[PDB]
Amino acid sequence: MRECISIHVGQAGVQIGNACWELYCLEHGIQPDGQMPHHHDSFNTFFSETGAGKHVPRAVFVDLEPTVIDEVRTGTYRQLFHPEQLITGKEDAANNYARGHYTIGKEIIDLVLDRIRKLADQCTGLQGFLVFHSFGGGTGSGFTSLLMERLSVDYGKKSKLEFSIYPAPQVSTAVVEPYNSILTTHTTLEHSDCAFMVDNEAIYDICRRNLDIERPTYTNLNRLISQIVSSITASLRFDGALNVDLTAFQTNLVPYPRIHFPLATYAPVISAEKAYHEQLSVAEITNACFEPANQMVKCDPRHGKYMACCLLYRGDVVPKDVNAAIATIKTKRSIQFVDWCPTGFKVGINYQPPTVVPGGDLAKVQRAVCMLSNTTAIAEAWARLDHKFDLMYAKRAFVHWYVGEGMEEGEFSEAREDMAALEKDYEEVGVDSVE
Amino acid sequence: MRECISIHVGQAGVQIGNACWELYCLEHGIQPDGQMPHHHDSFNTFFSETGAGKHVPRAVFVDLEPTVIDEVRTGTYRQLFHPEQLITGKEDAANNYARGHYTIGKEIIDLVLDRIRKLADQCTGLQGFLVFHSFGGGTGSGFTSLLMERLSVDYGKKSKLEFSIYPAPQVSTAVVEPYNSILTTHTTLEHSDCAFMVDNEAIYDICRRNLDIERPTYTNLNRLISQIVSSITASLRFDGALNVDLTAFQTNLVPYPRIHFPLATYAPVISAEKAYHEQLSVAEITNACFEPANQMVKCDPRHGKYMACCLLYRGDVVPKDVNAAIATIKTKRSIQFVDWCPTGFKVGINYQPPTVVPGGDLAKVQRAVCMLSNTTAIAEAWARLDHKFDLMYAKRAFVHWYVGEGMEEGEFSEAREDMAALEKDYEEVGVDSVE
Amino acid sequence: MAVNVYSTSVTSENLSRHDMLAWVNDSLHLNYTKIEQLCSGAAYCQFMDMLFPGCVHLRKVKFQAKLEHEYIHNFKVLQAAFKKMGVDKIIPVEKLVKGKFQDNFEFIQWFKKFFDANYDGKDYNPLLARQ
Amino acid sequence: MREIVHIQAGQCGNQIGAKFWEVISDEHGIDPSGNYVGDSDLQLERISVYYNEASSHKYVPRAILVDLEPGTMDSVRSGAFGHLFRPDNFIFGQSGAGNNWAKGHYTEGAELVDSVLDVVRKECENCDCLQGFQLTHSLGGGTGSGMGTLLISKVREEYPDRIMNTFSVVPSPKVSDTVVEPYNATLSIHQLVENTDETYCIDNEALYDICFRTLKLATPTYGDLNHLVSATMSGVTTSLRFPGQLNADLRKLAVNMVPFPRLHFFMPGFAPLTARGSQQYRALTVPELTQQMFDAKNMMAACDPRHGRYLTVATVFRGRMSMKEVDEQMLAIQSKNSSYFVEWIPNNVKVAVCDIPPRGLKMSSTFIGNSTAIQELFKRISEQFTAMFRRKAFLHWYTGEGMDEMEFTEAESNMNDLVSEYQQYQDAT
Amino acid sequence: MREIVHIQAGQCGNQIGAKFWEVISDEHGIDPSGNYVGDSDLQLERISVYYNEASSHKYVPRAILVDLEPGTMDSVRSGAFGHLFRPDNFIFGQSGAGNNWAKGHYTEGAELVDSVLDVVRKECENCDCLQGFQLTHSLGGGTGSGMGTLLISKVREEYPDRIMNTFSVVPSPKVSDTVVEPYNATLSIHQLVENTDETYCIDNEALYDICFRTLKLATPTYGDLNHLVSATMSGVTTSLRFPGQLNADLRKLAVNMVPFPRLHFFMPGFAPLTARGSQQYRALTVPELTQQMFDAKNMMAACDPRHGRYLTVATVFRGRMSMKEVDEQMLAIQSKNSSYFVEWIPNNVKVAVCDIPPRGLKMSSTFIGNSTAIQELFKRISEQFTAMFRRKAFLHWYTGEGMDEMEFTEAESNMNDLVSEYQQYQDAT
Ligand SMILES: Nc1nc2c(ncn2[C@@H]2O[C@H](COP(=O)(O)OP(=O)(O)OP(=O)(O)O)[C@@H](O)[C@H]2O)c(=O)[nH]1
Ligand SMILES: Nc1nc2c(ncn2[C@@H]2O[C@H](COP(=O)(O)OP(=O)(O)OP(=O)(O)O)[C@@H](O)[C@H]2O)c(=O)[nH]1
Ligand SMILES: Nc1nc2c(ncn2[C@@H]2O[C@H](COP(=O)(O)OP(=O)(O)OP(=O)(O)O)[C@@H](O)[C@H]2O)c(=O)[nH]1
Ligand SMILES: Nc1nc2c(ncn2[C@@H]2O[C@H](COP(=O)(O)OP(=O)(O)OP(=O)(O)O)[C@@H](O)[C@H]2O)c(=O)[nH]1
Ligand SMILES: [Mg+2]
Numbered sequence A, B: 001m002r003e004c005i006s007i008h009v010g011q012a013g014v015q016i017g018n019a020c021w022e023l024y025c026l027e028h029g030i031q032p033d034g035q036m037p038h039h040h041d042s043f044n045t046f047f048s049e050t051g052a053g054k055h056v057p058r059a060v061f062v063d064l065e066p067t068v069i070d071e072v073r074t075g076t077y078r079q080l081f082h083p084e085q086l087i088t089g090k091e092d093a094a095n096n097y098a099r100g101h102y103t104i105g106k107e108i109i110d111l112v113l114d115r116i117r118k119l120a121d122q123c124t125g126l127q128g129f130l131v132f133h134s135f136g137g138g139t140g141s142g143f144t145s146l147l148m149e150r151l152s153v154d155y156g157k158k159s160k161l162e163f164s165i166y167p168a169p170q171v172s173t174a175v176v177e178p179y180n181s182i183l184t185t186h187t188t189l190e191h192s193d194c195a196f197m198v199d200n201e202a203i204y205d206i207c208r209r210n211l212d213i214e215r216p217t218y219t220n221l222n223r224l225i226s227q228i229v230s231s232i233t234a235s236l237r238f239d240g241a242l243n244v245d246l247t248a249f250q251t252n253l254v255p256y257p258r259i260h261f262p263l264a265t266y267a268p269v270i271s272a273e274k275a276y277h278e279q280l281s282v283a284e285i286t287n288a289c290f291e292p293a294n295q296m297v298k299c300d301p302r303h304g305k306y307m308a309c310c311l312l313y314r315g316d317v318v319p320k321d322v323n324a325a326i327a328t329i330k331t332k333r334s335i336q337f338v339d340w341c342p343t344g345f346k347v348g349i350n351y352q353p354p355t356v357v358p359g360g361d362l363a364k365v366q367r368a369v370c371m372l373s374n375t376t377a378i379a380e381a382w383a384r385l386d387h388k389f390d391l392m393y394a395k396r397a398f399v400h401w402y403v404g405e406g407m408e409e410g411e412f413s414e415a416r417e418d419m420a421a422l423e424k425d426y427e428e429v430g431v432d433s434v435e
Numbered sequence C: 001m002a003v004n005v006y007s008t009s010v011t012s013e014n015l016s017r018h019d020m021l022a023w024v025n026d027s028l029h030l031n032y033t034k035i036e037q038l039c040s041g042a043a044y045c046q047f048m049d050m051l052f053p054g055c056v057h058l059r060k061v062k063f064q065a066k067l068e069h070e071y072i073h074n075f076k077v078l079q080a081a082f083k084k085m086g087v088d089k090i091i092p093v094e095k096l097v098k099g100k101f102q103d104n105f106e107f108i109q110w111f112k113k114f115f116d117a118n119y120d121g122k123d124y125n126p127l128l129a130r131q
Numbered sequence D, E: 001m002r003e004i005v006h007i008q009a010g011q012c013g014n015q016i017g018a019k020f021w022e023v024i025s026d027e028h029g030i031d032p033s034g035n036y037v038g039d040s041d042l043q044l045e046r047i048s049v050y051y052n053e054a055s056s057h058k059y060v061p062r063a064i065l066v067d068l069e070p071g072t073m074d075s076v077r078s079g080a081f082g083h084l085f086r087p088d089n090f091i092f093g094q095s096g097a098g099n100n101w102a103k104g105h106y107t108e109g110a111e112l113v114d115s116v117l118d119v120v121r122k123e124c125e126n127c128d129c130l131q132g133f134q135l136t137h138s139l140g141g142g143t144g145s146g147m148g149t150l151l152i153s154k155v156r157e158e159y160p161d162r163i164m165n166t167f168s169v170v171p172s173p174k175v176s177d178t179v180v181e182p183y184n185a186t187l188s189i190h191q192l193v194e195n196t197d198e199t200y201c202i203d204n205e206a207l208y209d210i211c212f213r214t215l216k217l218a219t220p221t222y223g224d225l226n227h228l229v230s231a232t233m234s235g236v237t238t239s240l241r242f243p244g245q246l247n248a249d250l251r252k253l254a255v256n257m258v259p260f261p262r263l264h265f266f267m268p269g270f271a272p273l274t275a276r277g278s279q280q281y282r283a284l285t286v287p288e289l290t291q292q293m294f295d296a297k298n299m300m301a302a303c304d305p306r307h308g309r310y311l312t313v314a315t316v317f318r319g320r321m322s323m324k325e326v327d328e329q330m331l332a333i334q335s336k337n338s339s340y341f342v343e344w345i346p347n348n349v350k351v352a353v354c355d356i357p358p359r360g361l362k363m364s365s366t367f368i369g370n371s372t373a374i375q376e377l378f379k380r381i382s383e384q385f386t387a388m389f390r391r392k393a394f395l396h397w398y399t400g401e402g403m404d405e406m407e408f409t410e411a412e413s414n415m416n417d418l419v420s421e422y423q424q425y426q427d428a429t
């Protein structure tokens, strides 16, 4: 009765979808063939039910290149997905926001909107859309921008969360990431009800340091992101001592309409060999969360301010211990709050412990914590992109690919001033008041 | 709930740590895998407890050469330790205080401080730190000096005990021990709340004479030092007729802030073959303690004065016999007290008898005694080092290694004047006052 | 920039309770009679003000503080000032806020050491800063 | 005779209500199925105050459960003591107010307020002689705060002369469980000061401190805190559902405890409270309870009464005890405590006594304190409000639901006026 | 009627208190579970002096246990006769004062003094008619000395007209169990002379000598020494908890034994004391006890009374005796030792007689002696104080906790003034 659909755009989006839906199928005891051999109907959120015992997910996998979609189709999770929600194009946007937003995206946007409308029309209490896309690829950025526009125009006021792969400061895979990232940020700034920044380099650092995996693959990063999203949706999908909804996320984390960019952190992240030797007290995991190393973005909060924080605990969590740990964090030195906000913590509790994936890397624990923090240091990251953009815009590099594709230089300018204005707004929010 | 953590610096620190933690695991009935198949939670002092029955030590093993740490990791006590506190460097300081205090020590000091803070933050009544290091190696001396600085700056007033391997008068293994010893002493003189000197030659002599082991190894010396440390911590870890805390040690043994260098002695030390044939009365073992041969430093107290003494008894000890023995000791001729201290005895009593390690060298006894004496003859030892230093400083030998590694000649000089000032302070304390 | 010091064990340099109380009273022109009242933290903020011009903003500190959260807020301001000047001595706010003799005296003696370290010889009126 | 309709709003409201109804079922000896398995007629002689007699000798609670998310309702239904509620009273929403007071009072609450009011109207018509209503909710979340404010406003506009109780959880001073609780608390206290005859301020921090210190529970779940809140509920209400050597009801406490219509913000307290092992080491006599009540560590509000003055003090007792002794302890605790009591209210203590102890315990008490210290609470919130109102922080959410800044200004002004009245009556002589 | 609150400070205080409460439980016939298992009503007719009657016919002692290290508290809890103490009274610190009087009186003791005083206040309010306080501590360790001094100060400032007893272990002359006990003893004696109505100086050396010679015990544990101290406690207090042909209490002994307010330092003694085998070889008659008391070897203080003068002497008896024989023995012992008693106090002997003998004995006694010989003790400590104060020995430890040298100087001056007063009153004619 409480429905919330997922939209995975781009190759990164589809791989996150693989991980997340593997985790969901494990959580609700669903075989890959859709059968079922602290729990309410918990699965009614993500899983719609047919006449038989088969359950199918309410998700849309869209990508212009058939590679990853064919891999999903021929993979183990073949019978599960309804064949319509595996939507494929012909040619990839190739790291070009132009190709993914004006020329190729339009050729299949109507089908995606139609399938989304079919999914929505048979729901009863749809809360919103979980959008998984990257800012690097042209497909992700451009098609996500177009889709957010279309959904906002079609659906009026529904929470639309973006779980993006923000481009890393130094470890980049493409060359034209700055252009695409600036364009997609400028486009989605007025549709993204709340966007959660995630960076690849920080997850690499976390995995090497904590998981002790000297050579991890994208599978593990997908596993961590799936754990994050499961922690986010645990309150909706399970009984909890203190429940929280998506609108609560959108309300407690966004002080100003233009500043809606929280960052995520998960704990604990320890291997089975290191599962013992330490008890995972709630204070311990909370200190691990507020430690700048366990953060999933290369931005250190200790040179900024915390506008808001949202902590979600799951498992055998004792609320008084929550209160004690939060007070101790409040007393610390590396957490200085902004002037206008004397109260920046939200707490949510769920009884259901996190679920361990067989063949995974983490260890089965009894308590888990996700921190969703809206802080000020993230603004610094934007500056870097701007600088890069300006450098790449100093000599008009790579501009022709966009220009000859249904694109104008004027939006490049306009996006640049919009990014500068966002930075100015962040800086203004940072400062303290008179009297 | 009464916690006290251990910090083992240098190869000697790690080996004495092996011995001490073997002794502890035997004392509290802990299998090497951390399970438990006159006692309070006695083990709660050294051993933190996990969700299961596994117990892990609150100690930090730090050493720049990974050899000894690998031996610990691959040894029998593998599963016991939490893998984080086995911290390794990459290259050893190589008997160079400069390398162990300015160049290499800085590269891992932050991790050590972070782990120490993590250990401390989950304690409740932390009393202090037991630091096991040598003055000979560059790693031990330099890194211990740096770590004492950082701990003093970070933690305000917690007792910090140093059980150092003081360089022997004639039996040396290095050539640059004087420089490192003076540098580390001058550095730690302002942070060592109490430093307990122990010498290798004296322990060799004790092992040859009493244990009748014609060819002892470092294992035996580590066993003796571990027995001393266990006798020190028995009052904290066990029920006693007269308990004593670390602050009591720091208070009763330090008359002047600069003179805080007691020496240790243990009794009885007799083999199983010689375990019989004598009843080991408290008077007998006390006489053995005050005998100059059983002391663990090559300094004979009969040419100095006793500023203070602290005797800890454990086992089936009857206090009246303690009083009678102490009176008889006071009556003897070879113990002349300083003028300003008419009462230089502290006594502590514990019910728990000493624990015998299987495969060891000592014999299971019913009474045991540790003598911790702050006397004046120890000053003589310092003079020797000074002479050596001046000799090695006469021709500027080995200076370039320190100079080209981030050290100033003025540091060597100021250490020399500070050491001479310490000798003058010892001398002026030694003399008697008028009227 | 400011230099930093420590306090472990020194003789002839540890000042008495009443002496330090008179020191703070004379340096801030006020009449504290209990040293644990310095759990309020206003005295520390005004000490930071006199130690470095600016470097703080006394409008947020609450000189009329009488509760625990007010103490926490004042100590947050103090921690911000400490971070600004680069002094890295982490302060134990959790024990200080309770207003108990031990940690307050420990903190104030360390603060006396640090204050003697970083003071020049300027003169001013504490009242104008206080109001 | 003298029936009471119980309303629960917000997740904390439903949880407190579930524990409360468990306590009442224990007191009146009712199975979860709803049958009577007691052993004394007195349990049934006033069963009608909270329970409606259905057919086949079955008793159902006269409770209304309101929320905007089905998770809480599913939790209540699934667990034990869930079958006795009437399934029609299970009114719930779908999306949840999302910690936003607008959706709880203007947007989402508007879609269920009509159904809730029809159910309340039906229950009022079905009851014999209505006494009043009591609401259990919180001021932190959007749902409970906004929906409770709306329901109280509509009900009092539907029933002017009835009395309405609210047991509202007030946010803790040190920590905040939410982020935008200043606005919600300000608006909710505004609605309460307009249209409530008394409220019992309750704070999670105070309950945590009491349970850790007095109860010696190192691991306190919400179960125990809700149990203490329910015990306070039952101790307040016991004077109406059972006889006593000095009978009282909600009206008597309201009249004695409210000297000025705006000042109706009270603090609850309970006694005795003992650890599991330390129970037999003490004789449960009247002066022990009296000395246990009048202290900060047993007050469920996060404000020391010695920061202010005690205006009035209500003490309800349960169990066979001598009246002279209760009177003597009240006289002594007033005489030795002349400083914290208002001078221009001679004999500022109300005493009520029942005959039925609270299960397992030989006798117990219940403390209601009308003191001005709570104004500090308001000041803190007020300050935080300004700190979050000066830069227009999170206001665009509440403006996007149609409300204006003028309500925020007016409500802040009214709370400041309430603080001023508390201060003035504190300074009266 | 005439209730006494017993406080225990330091590890010595807790151990002596444990043995003392065992002795009292034996006297009043109380199960360690706390039930009454006696056989005579007289045991219960004055049970309330030390025991509070909790519910279900259970009795719990009116004792408070204070320390800064949990080892002693755990030892008391684990062993037998441990379930009787009320669990909240087990007030203890965590780190221990570390033999430092500053931490016991200023730094650490301030962290528990408030809780201890609240417990004392609750007990005083709960008692019917308070008589006075008795403290068991030592002057050697930092914890017992400092905490006891602080508690005595605060309690007497809270209750001026009450009487307060201290049974403080004084360091032995031959050996020192600690190193810095001169300062601790000096400051503690300063506090005691300021704010105590009497103290019983007790020394380990004297008990060792007594047990070795008189008791013929070659292996005396602390159990036996604490047993003798507890027996002295019970013998002093027995005149209040049981009838007698000549009843007394603490007030009568305080008035008779203290001719000048400062001079309130006494020495205890017990009789009869016999070896295990030599018990039946001697008739227990009043004279035999009389010459057993008046001699150095049965004096628990390390000071020979023949070195000085006897100012006043209290003698308490227990067991069926003829009063004439007691009076004749007292007159004879005063007459034949006329050199040793002050001339300007004619009839300087107080006699009290109870009705109930002690354990496994037909009759027994208890000796309190106010004599000037103890001044030697003080002088010795004073000299040692100077010997450790002229060169600033260990002073920086007490300087680092905030004390000033003027405090040490003033305490030394007051102690020397006390020595001078003893000398002068000894030389009076
Ligand atoms: N963390 C993480 N990032 C991924 C993963 N897969 C792809 N990415 C990100 O995606 C970026 C590559 O661009 P994509 O968005 O995948 O491009 P696309 O979706 O294939 O669309 P085209 O650009 O037209 O090919 C890289 O910079 C990665 O950071 C993944 O499995 N885990
Ligand atoms: N008594 C005793 N002394 C030891 C033992 N192991 C090492 N030492 C002392 O340590 C000195 C050698 O220098 P170390 O401190 O071990 O040097 P290190 O810790 O390996 O660090 P580097 O100098 O950089 O290699 C010798 O002079 C020994 O006296 C031991 O097991 N027992
Ligand atoms: N005493 C007590 N308070 C509780 C308990 N559970 C929750 N609370 C309080 O209730 C508040 C939770 O917000 P609610 O008013 O319940 O909000 P909601 O009903 O979940 O509605 P939404 O916020 O829109 O999701 C928290 O701030 C807690 O302080 C409980 O079990 N006992
Ligand atoms: N008569 C008697 N005296 C004892 C006994 N146990 C300890 N003492 C005395 O008490 C003193 C012990 O010091 P305490 O006052 O107990 O110090 P503490 O309570 O342990 O506190 P810290 O010194 O800080 O550890 C010693 O000097 C002993 O002379 C005992 O069983 N019987
Ligand atoms: Mg692609």
Ligand SMILES: [Mg+2]
Binding pocket: B010, B011, B064, B065, B092, B093, B094, B137, B139
């Ligand atoms: Mg080495």
Ligand SMILES: [Mg+2]
Binding pocket: A243, D011, D068, D069, D096, D097, D098, D141, D143
């Ligand atoms: Mg809700």
Ligand SMILES: [Mg+2]
Binding pocket: B243, E011, E068, E069, E096, E097, E098, E141, E143
């Ligand atoms: Mg002690």
